[model samples]
Target: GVLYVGSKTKEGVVHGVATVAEKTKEQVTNVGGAVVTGVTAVAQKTVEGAGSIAAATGFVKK
Candidate 1:
């Protein structure tokens, strides 16, 4: 009976660890996605501005 109880406890711990790991991964991915969005916005702005400036300067013939 003691061995059976121990086994059950070990199984529970393993499952709990899995749940924690999954939650951690989800949070990391979300945080990473947020960071990427900020960077992407900045990069997009730079590219758009460059094109407009180039066209205005006649570097880019339309």
Candidate 2:
């Protein structure tokens, strides 16, 4: 299951969310926009969406 954990700093502005799940190197990097983030296995995450490339940052472990 996916859960979003973050704080609302303003009325309509939020920083990001912390997610919990398992992911792969290519998959994580493809989503987070770098290969370094994939080196380690992470449960909670915060990935910024870029475009079509980063938009597909879901269900990568399967």
Candidate 3:
């Protein structure tokens, strides 16, 4: 008796998905200081009209 025939097959490695990210219009705003609002409104009388009217009048603040 003798051998008949040889076997034939194939092999391969599985691949994975790839992704990429980047920034385009990456504009950043820088701020140091801002317009601070103090003493919004006044009532009767004041010297420079700067300080709070409520505190200056002391309307029953005691």
Candidate 4:
């Protein structure tokens, strides 16, 4: 254990490339997750909005 504390000993080091990889992946997943949720919410709202618009047009035509 005392033979490793200078550098290249990054195998157990979560402060080097480990942190770089993990933190980078974390941000990617976070962005993709929120994008899915936001896309779904907006998708439904657009559908509903168009439905109402069609109804309004129908009423005017009648």
Candidate 5:
């Protein structure tokens, strides 16, 4: 919507709103992927740390 910058002309013309939409989609998808990746990494690390503590306290088997 906001990305669309209407028509243009050279020797001919093109209506390029779809181009803007595609670019926006790519950027948003990339950002969402990165966010999911980071969250997954953090959660895994936290669980690993908690498991280490549990082992040290003899609450879980090594």
Candidate 6:
């Protein structure tokens, strides 16, 4: 999977385009940024309720 880099919203949501720059999980959270690696698995109480969310690592702008 590719590493998606971007800024996070106030509500903890990620927003912005990803870059190809190499970064570590620790470096991502040092500048108010987050490493949005991929979407997280959503809760599935039922067959129709199953969904997925974004998977992100908190980070700061480098």
Give the range of the ten consecutive residues with the poorest summed lDDT in model 1.
30-39
Give the 10-residue window scoring lowest on summed lDDT in candidate 3: 33-42
4 or 6: which has the higher TM-score?
Answer: 6
TM-score of 1: 0.12
Better-scoring candidate (lDDT), 2 or 5: 2
- List, residue by residue over 1-62, the lDDT tens digit for candidate 6: 55555544454554446445465543332233332333442323322355553455554466
TM-score on alpha carbons, each prediction: 0.12, 0.15, 0.17, 0.11, 0.13, 0.16
Q: Candidate 5: misplaced stretches above 4 Å?
A: 12-62
What's the residue-level lDDT of 50 in candidate 5?
A: 36
Candidate 3 local lDDT, 1-62, one digit each (tens): 55355434456333333344468554433322222332332222333556443322223324
Candidate 1 per-residue C-alpha lDDT over 1-62 given as tens digits, one digit per residue, 9 for 90 to 100: 22222222332311211223453432421122112232112323344343533222223335
Best by TM-score: 3
Whole-model alpha-carbon lDDT for candidate 3: 0.36
> lDDT per residue, candidate 4, 5-62, as tens digits?
3333333522211223443422421122112232112322344343433222222223
| Model 2 lDDT tens row, 18-51 | 5555765443423344333322234544445663
Model 3 residue 17 distance off true place after TM-score fit, in angstroms: 44
Scored by lDDT, model 5 comes in at 0.32
Candidate 1: pairs in clash: none
Distance from true location, Cα of 42 in model 6, Å: 21
Q: lDDT per prediction?
A: 0.27, 0.44, 0.36, 0.28, 0.32, 0.42
Query: lDDT (0-100) at residue 38 of candidate 3?
Result: 28
- Tens-digit per-residue lDDT, 1-62, candidate 5: 23334444456543422323453432421122112232112322344343433322223335
